[PDB]
């Protein structure tokens, strides 16, 4: 599975969903997650993310390991998103800011 990590929080560009063949992205107020059992590891989404927040599971940075299980848990409770929508209104201000997990909304 591929995993969405910190820098998606408060950006949520949603470019990643247009390339996913199996539609395994789930939507939260201000972040997206990949459902691990549905992802077929095609790697097509990782180049699409403007925030470069998507990583192959095996390449998730050492200080971002919690996102692995967080993607799994939140994918069981958030709704499925299959279409690109507009970025969060001030996505570019937050793109690049570190430690955004403290701002995650359920
Ligand atoms: S690797 Fe492919 S299947 Fe997995 S989320 Fe990305 S685009 Fe979808
Ligand atoms: S910001 Fe998040 S919504 Fe997709 S395009 Fe990047 S993982």
UniProtKB/Swiss-Prot annotation:
List of residues binding [4Fe-4S] cluster: 20, 39, 42, 45
Pfam hit, one: DUF3470
Keywords for this protein: 3Fe-4S, 4Fe-4S, DNA-binding, Electron transport, Iron, Iron-sulfur, Metal-binding, Repeat, Transport
Domain 4Fe-4S ferredoxin-type: 1-29, 30-59
Cofactor dependency: [4Fe-4S] cluster; [3Fe-4S] cluster
Record's cofactor remark: Binds 1 [4Fe-4S] cluster. Binds 1 [3Fe-4S] cluster.
Binding site for [3Fe-4S] cluster: 8, 16, 49
Renumbered residue ranges of the record's region Disordered: 83-106
Keyword DNA-binding tagged: yes
InterPro entries, per the entry: 4Fe4S_Fe-S-bd (IPR017896), 4Fe4S_Fe_S_CS (IPR017900), 7Fe_ferredoxin (IPR000813), Fd_C (IPR022569), FdxA (IPR054829), RnfB_subfamily (IPR050294)
Bias-annotated ranges (Basic and acidic residues): 95-106
GO molecular function, one term: metal ion binding
PROSITE patterns xrefs: 4FE4S_FER_1, 4FE4S_FER_2
Role noted for this protein: Ferredoxins are iron-sulfur proteins that transfer electrons in a wide variety of metabolic reactions. This ferredoxin could play a role in regulating gene expression by interacting directly with DNA.
Protein name: Ferredoxin-1
Species the sequence originates in: Azotobacter vinelandii
């Amino acid at each position: 599975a591929f995993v969405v990590t910190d820098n998606c929080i408060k950006c949520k560009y949603t470019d990643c969903v247009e390339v996913c063949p199996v539609d395994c992205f789930y939507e939260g107020p201000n972040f997206l997650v990949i459902h691990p059992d549905e992802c077929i590891d095609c790697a097509l989404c990782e180049p699409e993310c403007p925030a470069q927040a998507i990583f192959s599971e095996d390449e998730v940075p050492e200080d971002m390991q919690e996102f692995i299980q967080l993607n799994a848990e939140l994918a069981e409770v958030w709704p499925n998103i299959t279409e690109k929508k507009d970025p969060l209104p001030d996505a570019e201000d937050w793109d690049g800011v570190k430690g955004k997990l403290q701002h995650l909304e359920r």
